[PDB]
Amino acid sequence: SNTQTVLPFTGLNTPSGVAVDSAGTVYVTDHGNNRVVKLAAGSNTQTVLPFTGLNTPSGVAVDSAGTVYVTDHGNNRVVKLAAGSNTQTVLPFTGLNTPSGVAVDSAGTVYVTDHGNNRVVKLAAGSNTQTVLPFTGLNTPSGVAVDSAGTVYVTDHGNNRVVKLAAGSNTQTVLPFTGLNTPSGVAVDSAGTVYVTDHGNNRVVKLAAGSNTQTVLPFTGLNTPSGVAVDSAGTVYVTDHGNNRVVKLA
């Protein structure tokens, strides 16, 4: 599709991040209202999820069981809510500072950009010990995504770059995006194409794996976009933070 459409979230205030599940349900962190909202595909009526005591939530991820994970940025913590449950749990990360983003892999391992500590941490399901991943030379990571191969992708805000860390070898590669300015969010589709919100340049750009061609997607009029998500059909969703809206492109 060539035309962006605004999703009918109601009462949104500075959306900070977005995730989409395999049913096309769209989850958004409403940073300004301290809440997380979701909209089923084709619905006009959002649901406010029963998270509690959030403070400027910065990011959201959804696992294959429908469990929703939120970086509760102002409380230095990560919370999760199982599908159908009305009581969140706090994941046992320690020492986080203003965490910016979250991703979850097919094993349920949770990855968090610990933005205030310039590091990326991961916690396997059921574990008490978090692991600092061997990224190097980060400057304020702003978002994270993980693919089926366990490769972890991170937007490096201060260095205007996207990095990926291969599982096993721990080889870190800078993806050949160009002209980025404060990238804010990242998503990866099932084909390995990487999508990035180029916050400082008000655009969203995608790069297929191994390519030196980046594509500006035909969103229009963006202002400081904060997050991106891509569904199994290739539909792209963006939190257009500066315009208080969530836009999509099918």
Pairing of strands 59-62, 161-165: unpaired
DSSP letter at 243 equals G
Instruction: For domain 1-250, give the CATH number.
Output: 2.120.10.30
Tell me, rounded to whole angstroms, the distance of Cα 30 from its chain centroid: 13
Domain extent listing, the chain: 1-250
Which residues, including other chains, have CB under 8 Å from residue 196's CB and lie 6 or more apart? 155, 162, 177, 180, 183, 185, 186, 204, 205, 206, 207, 228
DSSP letter at 200 equals G
What are the strands, taking DSSP E only, across 76-148?
77-81, 89-90, 101-104, 110-114, 119-123, 131-132, 141-146
Which residues, including other chains, have CB under 8 Å from residue 14's CB and lie 6 or more apart? 30, 31, 32, 241, 244
Of 159, 17, 26, the closest CA to residue 101 belongs to 17
Which residues, including other chains, have CB under 8 Å from residue 242's CB and lie 6 or more apart? 222, 223, 224, 225
Tell me, rounded to whole angstroms, the distance of Cα 133 from its chain centroid: 18
- Give backbone dihedrals phi and psi of 212, rounded to 5 degrees, phi first: -110, 30
